Design a protein around this ligand. Structure first.
Ligand SMILES: OC[C@H]1O[C@H](O[C@H]2O[C@H](CO)[C@@H](O)[C@H](O)[C@H]2O)[C@H](O)[C@@H](O)[C@@H]1O
Ligand SMILES: OC[C@H]1O[C@H](O[C@H]2O[C@H](CO)[C@@H](O)[C@H](O)[C@H]2O)[C@H](O)[C@@H](O)[C@@H]1O
Ligand code: FE
Ligand code: FE
Lengths: 192, 192
């Protein structure tokens, strides 16, 4: 049924911010496992011939947890780039300034939401129905893809497997890696 | 102020099931952080002269997340022993037989509960008010200590930091390690 998307860059392209080993396990195993598990759940069911987004928005229990984790992870690989990092640009840079006054204040605000996102979770940059940006946290497999009026723009995966190999317990070190990789091209494509 | 209890065994005593490095991070860093955070939250609140258990049983939000995680980890360390593992003994071996028919059926049931416990979580062996055992799952910092009349007997921490260093994504390998360390003396003390 579903397939594991290719990573949008080479396996060592995010070094030294996220390691080759971390991509091998995180994409090659964790992401892959949600694809396998979902493909094992849907045969014969009403979800069999639906798209992944259709399934995320219409399921609960294990079908949701795997489908939403497939979507979220694909969204996360796209939120990183060997050519990202640095200051934001475009429409998204101006929208960050509009909501938080400055890029630096926005970074401080997302870092605080990310470090304190308790347990397995995701911290997101979203665009609300009034066109303004905000940061929201979700837990486990939950995702703003299911929230009316809310458009995902960027995400940071805070389940421990996302960073434990490279950073152990220090999420602030992982976030410094994320800011070095953040894909503003994908953020602007989503915003626009 | 609350303090981090000493580990009940040497830093390499659970090898090769759980490594010295995992104990250094899990106990010396993760467990410690919850102590530190809770002590920061307590002054100026209704929790200033309360025992850890009184706090776990009467709080929510951050005070609960940190207090319950402190209690949970302390109980987890006691649930492992360099002299544990193997077949259960005494009163707990018999209760396991009464509830599940056999130790192997119990072990299959717990593994199934643990491997499927989604996200950061804990799997528990508990004694119900009716005197029988059962297996229950909790998410993030939640714990059966808040369930009136339920008595915790053993737990296995399933947050990824508990096993990622040693086993990466393979929880069943981690669970084989747990079965080689399980502390039946603590299980029996708790049951009795
Ligand atoms: O797909 C299996 C089930 O996964 C979830 O339930 C598991 O994980 C929970 C914590 O996130 C535990 O409380 C629970 O005991 C586990 O079974 C999901 O919520 C269920 O609907 C799924 O069937
Ligand atoms: O102690 C800080 C807070 O921890 C929890 O809230 C954080 O973690 C949640 C996920 O478990 C996120 O959804 C939330 O956005 C974070 O702020 C707790 O629920 C709060 O009450 C605590 O104040
Ligand atoms: Fe992940
Ligand atoms: Fe833990």
């Amino acid at each position: 049924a579903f397939e594991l998307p290719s990573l949008p860059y080479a396996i060592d392209a995010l070094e030294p911010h996220i390691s080759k080993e971390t991509l091998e396990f995180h994409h090659g195993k964790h992401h892959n496992t949600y694809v396998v598990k979902l493909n094992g759940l849907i045969p014969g069911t009403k979800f069999e011939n639906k798209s992944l987004e259709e399934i995320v928005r219409s399921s609960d229990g294990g079908v949701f947890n795997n489908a939403a984790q497939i979507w979220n992870h694909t969204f996360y690989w796209n939120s990183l780039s060997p050519n990202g990092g640095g200051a934001p640009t475009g429409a998204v840079a101006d929208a960050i300034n509009a909501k938080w006054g400055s890029f630096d204040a926005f970074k401080e605000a997302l870092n605080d939401k990310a470090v304190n996102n308790f347990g397995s979770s995701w911290t997101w940059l979203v665009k609300l129905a009034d066109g303004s940006l905000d940061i929201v946290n979700t837990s486990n497999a939950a995702t703003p893809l299911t929230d009316d009026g809310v458009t995902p723009i960027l995400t940071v995966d805070l389940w421990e497997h996302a960073y434990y190999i490279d950073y152990r317990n220090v999420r602030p070190d992982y976030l410094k890696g994320f800011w070095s990789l953040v894909n503003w091209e994908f953020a602007n494509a989503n915003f626009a």
